[PDB]
Amino acid sequence: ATSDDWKSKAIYQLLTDRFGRADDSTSNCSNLSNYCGGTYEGITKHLDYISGMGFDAIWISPIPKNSDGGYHGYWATDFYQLNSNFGDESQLKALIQAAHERDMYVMLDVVANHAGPTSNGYSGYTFGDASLYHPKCTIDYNDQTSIEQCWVADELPDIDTENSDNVAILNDIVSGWVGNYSFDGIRIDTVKHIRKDFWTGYAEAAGVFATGEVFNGDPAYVGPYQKYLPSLINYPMYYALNDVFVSKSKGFSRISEMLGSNRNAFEDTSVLTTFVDNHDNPRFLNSQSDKALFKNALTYVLLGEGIPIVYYGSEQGFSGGADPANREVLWTTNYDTSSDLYQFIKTVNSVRMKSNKAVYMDIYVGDNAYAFKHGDALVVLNNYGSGSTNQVSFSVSGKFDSGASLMDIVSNITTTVSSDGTVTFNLKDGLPAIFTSA
Ligand SMILES: *[C@@H]1O[C@H](CO)[C@@H](O)[C@H](O)[C@H]1NC(C)=O
Ligand SMILES: [Ca+2]
């Protein structure tokens, strides 16, 4: 599927090892650093749980055979063999067919930069001897040559992407994964760790929409990558959202400033993928346990500028910290669709799905409150947190008619635009508000 096809989607990011199994067990996993037993069949069994929340795309773990302990898929050995932990060809195709029957997209995570660590040599690996990898070195994160030539985590064999045989093989691998399985898009791992010009050829080989992971918070660093890939993961907005909602070290001017910095660094901000947590960073609720702040952040993710990504287990209030504690098994929850955050996400996705897709950011930039439009809906965020009944007030002159009746989808709140265009109302429990006009 194309960039334009993906612009309207909202992605549920899951770890294949951690989402679901064929069995109905709610037992915890005793070691989150090794395989817990999640499978493709486990995702198929629970697709209705995911679509029930209003997601219409999933991003799954990399699929190839991995080195020991590579439950996350990022440590490939033989790129042309499936990881048998997750299932076989038939089970992966049955998942993609089940998703497609539900009009859901499937996005494959892909690695070109590295293989899994060695304990001996490279027997069994697609890149089957030391000469096919860059010499081992540690990354100097001030030196882009070091970032590209040296080994991730000091330990992941860095494929020699300047060997043209290796480039042709990497392009063949991603063309085959996408073509053989009819994936609709890819999420590209470790983009900053290979020279930019590689990515043109690799994404063309894949032949579908790609969102690249450039793990850096600076728009001036990430933005230039959109010359080479059609979308990047919005790490710069992730840091702004965390400043406003998790530490409250900035007011909402930080989100307004970051929208402007992204407009100045990126060709097309509308296709960047928005998120507030993921598998590489502590969950939101680890640092900031206030679920009203989480709900405000999730509202930004789902309705603000960009393509939303929500990390699995957000809807069950998961609160684990540093990797792998943030990679909890979902089945302890028994896929409870009555969970407050599941019903919240379903509510917000119903706005997303069914409103015009025109987003107008920065209707109001306050210190502790903020408003924007998502289609016809007026979205109001705040960082006062749980228990707040603070007043929020701002002008909507020329955006909503004077005297217009606004009704909040989240809480009971009804408010009338004043005779001169001002919206003024009290929060309920610090919750986001999503107003429509009568
Ligand atoms: C794609 O399928 C072809 C036909 O079996 C096979 O030769 C190729 O290895 C497959 N590619 C991958 C990356 O699985
Ligand atoms: Ca590299």
Numbering used by the authors: 1 to 438
The authors write:
Here, we describe the structure and function of three novel α-amylases from Cordyceps farinosa (CfAM), Rhizomucor pusillus (RpAM) and Thamnidium elegans (TeAM) with a higher stability and pH-tolerance with the potential to act as novel biocatalysts for various industrial processes. The sequence of all three enzymes groups them in the GH13 sub-family 1 along with, for example, the amylase from Aspergillus oryzae (also known as TAKA amylase). All three amylases have the classical domain structure with a central (β/α)8-barrel with the active site located on its C-terminal face, together with a small subdomain, inserted between the third strand and helix and a C-terminal β-sandwich. All three amylases have as their hallmark a shortened loop between β2/α3 and two shorter loops in subdomain B located between β3 and α4 of the central (β/α)8-barrel, compared to structures of other fungal amylases, e.g., TAKA-amylase.
